[PDB]
Amino acid sequence: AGAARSLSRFRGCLAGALLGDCVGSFYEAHDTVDLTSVLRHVQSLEPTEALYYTDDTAMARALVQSLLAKEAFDEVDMAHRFAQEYKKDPDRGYGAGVVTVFKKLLNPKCRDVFEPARAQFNGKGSYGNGGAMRVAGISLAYSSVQDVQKFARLSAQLTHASSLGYNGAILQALAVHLALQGESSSEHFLKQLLGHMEDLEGDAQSVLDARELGMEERPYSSRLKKIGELLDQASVTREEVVSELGNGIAAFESVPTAIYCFLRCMEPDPEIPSAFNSLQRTLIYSISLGGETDTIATMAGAIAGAYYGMDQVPESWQQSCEGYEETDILAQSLHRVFQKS
Numbered sequence: 001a002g003a004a005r006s007l008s009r010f011r012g013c014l015a016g017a018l019l020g021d022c023v024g025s026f027y028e029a030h031d032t033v034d035l036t037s038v039l040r041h042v043q044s045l046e047p048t049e050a051l052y053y054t055d056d057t058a059m060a061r062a063l064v065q066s067l068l069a070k071e072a073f074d075e076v077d078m079a080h081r082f083a084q085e086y087k088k089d090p091d092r093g094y095g096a097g098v099v100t101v102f103k104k105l106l107n108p109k110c111r112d113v114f115e116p117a118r119a120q121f122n123g124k125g126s127y128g129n130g131g132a133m134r135v136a137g138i139s140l141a142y143s144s145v146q147d148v149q150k151f152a153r154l155s156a157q158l159t160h161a162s163s164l165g166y167n168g169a170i171l172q173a174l175a176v177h178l179a180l181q182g183e184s185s186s187e188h189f190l191k192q193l194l195g196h197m198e199d200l201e202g203d204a205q206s207v208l209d210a211r212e213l214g215m216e217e218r219p220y221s222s223r224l225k226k227i228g229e230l231l232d233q234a235s236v237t238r239e240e241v242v243s244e245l246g247n248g249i250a251a252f253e254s255v256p257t258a259i260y261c262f263l264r265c266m267e268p269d270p271e272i273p274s275a276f277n278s279l280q281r282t283l284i285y286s287i288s289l290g291g292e293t294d295t296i297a298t299m300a301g302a303i304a305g306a307y308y309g310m311d312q313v314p315e316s317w318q319q320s321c322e323g324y325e326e327t328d329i330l331a332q333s334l335h336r337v338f339q340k341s
């Protein structure tokens with residue numbers, strides 16, 4: 001709420017991401033999740049820090065702490081903060097591949113911090129959603145689309161060297177960027193994202209990366225078009241959403257899904273009790289898709305939090321989350337340091 005890039009939007013963004021991670025972690029990897037059972041489960045969140053966060057939040061915190069420490073993007077600082085955060089607490093639920101990147105970055109002889117990510121998966125790079133799950137702080141630090149794209153990509157490339165992974169990080173950072181600007185139609189929001197992704201996916205390196213994996217040309221653009229069709233479709237079922245967009249570990253099977261959850265839930269849903277506000281119903285809906293509920297809800301929550309603001313962050317939900325106060329302090333610090341208030 002309030003003006004574009006207000007303090008409330010910054011606080012709401014990081015709190016929404018934290019809620020998604022902590023509340024979504026209960027259903028992580030559940031093939032199916034019944035909506036009625038989700039509504040039952042958030043009852044427990046009704047009137048501290050009993051819900052632990054996962055690698056989504058741990059990496060998001062390290063990314064933001066690097067930006068605040070250098071008041072800029074600093075590849076060596078950020079890479080080392082990622083690796084040291086893993087070292088301090090390896091059990092947060094990290095992807096199996098990315099741990100190899102952290103161990104290489106922990107070797108002090110490693111003096112080109114982008115090269116471990118490039119060796120992943122026979123030298124093609126990861127397409128997992130880890131670059132996107134943590135990227136929201138980039139859009140808090142940087143106001144222009146140009147800088148958002150540039151540093152979403154660079155921060156993602158520290159672990160995700162495939163364009164299929166870093167273009168998902170860019171897409172997620174662009175969605176947070178737009179949400180921070182305030183009121184929009186769902187169709188205008190989608191159309192702006194589609195325009196940006198069509199520009200990026202025209203690049204020769206993106207086309208090659210997709211072709212080598214057997215995928216369609218312009219995989220994010222294709223899924224954003226599918227979002228537009230789904231938003232106009234009657235009687236959309238969870239099975240249809242998952243079939244067209246995904247609910248998986250790959251960035252292309254989870255970032256468009258998170259954006260769909262945000263856009264769909266801009267409007268009331270008769271299936272979700274009206275006692276829940278817009279941020280709450282976005283998180284409930286995201287978790288009801290099952291699969292990678294932790295990361296899909298974290299990303300949908302970052303977008304919804306930026307759009308709806310801190311007034312929609314329920315205190316009873318927030319105070320259930322490990323580290324909610326540190327998350328809030330980091331949001332306020334980003335607003336002061338970068339937004340220069």
Ligand SMILES: Nc1ncnc2c1ncn2[C@@H]1O[C@H](COP(=O)(O)OP(=O)(O)OC[C@H]2O[C@H](O)[C@H](O)[C@@H]2O)[C@@H](O)[C@H]1O
Nearest residue numbers: 055093094095096097098121125126127128129130249295
């Ligand atoms: N090019 C590839 N070829 C084959 N498999 C791949 C490729 N890229 C990724 N994978 C598979 O994707 C896996 C993860 O890629 P990773 O880079 O390790 O980690 P993340 O940080 O993105 O974590 C992704 C989620 O996993 C957890 O839930 C986290 O919380 C994240 O939400 C690999 O182990 C491979 O099986």
Ligand SMILES: [Mg+2]
Nearest residue numbers: 054055093294
């Ligand atoms: Mg996780």
